[PDB]
Amino acid sequence: DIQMTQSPSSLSASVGDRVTITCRASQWIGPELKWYQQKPGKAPKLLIYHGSILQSGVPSRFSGSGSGTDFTLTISSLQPEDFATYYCQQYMYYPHTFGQGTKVEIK
Amino acid sequence: DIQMTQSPSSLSASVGDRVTITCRASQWIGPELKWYQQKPGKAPKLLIYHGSILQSGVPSRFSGSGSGTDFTLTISSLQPEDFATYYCQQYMYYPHTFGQGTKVEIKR
Amino acid sequence: EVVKFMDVYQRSYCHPIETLVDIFQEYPDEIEYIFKPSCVPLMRCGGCCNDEGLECVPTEESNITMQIMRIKPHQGQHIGEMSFLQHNKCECRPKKDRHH
Amino acid sequence: VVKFMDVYQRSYCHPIETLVDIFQEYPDEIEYIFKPSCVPLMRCGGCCNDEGLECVPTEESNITMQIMRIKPHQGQHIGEMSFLQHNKCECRPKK
Questions:
Q1: Rounded to a whole number, what is the distance in Å from the CA of B95 to chain C's nearest CA?
Q2: Which of B11, B89, B105, D49 has the highest local Cβ count within 10 Å?
Q3: Contacts of A89 (CB under 8 A, 6+ apart)
Q4: Which candidate from D17, D40, D78 shows the least CB-CB separation from C5?
């Protein structure tokens, strides 16, 4: 099993701020990592797949990067709707392991 | 014009012997070299082209090697009908140019 | 020995690779000349993205110039400079086709 | 500018690293999805610059690679698969 280590655990930011979230994989997973947005009592929404490719209908201020063991999700200019918990998932090896998640909070 | 330096001018050999003819191009011509056999009263007969590829119907005792500037024709075992003059020709650049030829003679 | 899985993946994953391209393909209009060589070595996007919805494509291009012999058969030839398209960077982008 | 001579030499019939889809080399097994979907193999490439000649392999061998075999939903596993590569190539006449 691959261990996904996500940081930070939680963070507080203001509207308009740039936000950066990281995942490390315990061993090489190539580019095959997804990022999900999960709001309380709802379905997780797929934001990015293959490391840096936006799912359709996701705003451009979302972006991803990385290949191998180290990945990053950046939100360039934060919006009130973007306050949520964000999860990374790897899909190189079965089972598809997740990161602990990061809670993006209002200041 | 590309100059082809054939050598030697003339050989004496006995039936069964191994014969080795060389041809040097003044400039690089890749593998685009033909060897011809020339006998009295006939048109020259294509033995080898593209450096090393035998023409259809040519005995396997004839071989050709080399690429670029230095080439070789070999006859592994000379037969009576092989005594003749042999020529190289480059066909990389027009005009296609010939060696001065090697005359392969019977030993007396 | 045996090529480990991680290496097979990385070496095949999309990137620019030396590819042998036929000149008549890159210049299908030219009718009189014949080219020697008939084909040229060009860095081009190749490999797999490992996703049916993604395809590999060039994001950075350039040009390179090569000397190509241009031959009018049975008449003559000259060595002419000819430029060919290259691919400097490749990325896996989503296809244009409707989702299956 | 690349010199004609080097162009010719570099594009002349020879073994070149080539990226081959696995489904070409194994079209009988549609049950599995492969990953990666394509592998790097030495195969004959280039031109002979003679209308009546063609580049063809004259020495072959097998190479073995770890590939992930994916049954759509049930699961996946990395096993060994062997592929044909070309060790030496030659311009030979077409017929």
A1: 8
A2: D49
A3: A4, A33, A34, A35, A36, A96, A97, A98, A99
A4: D78
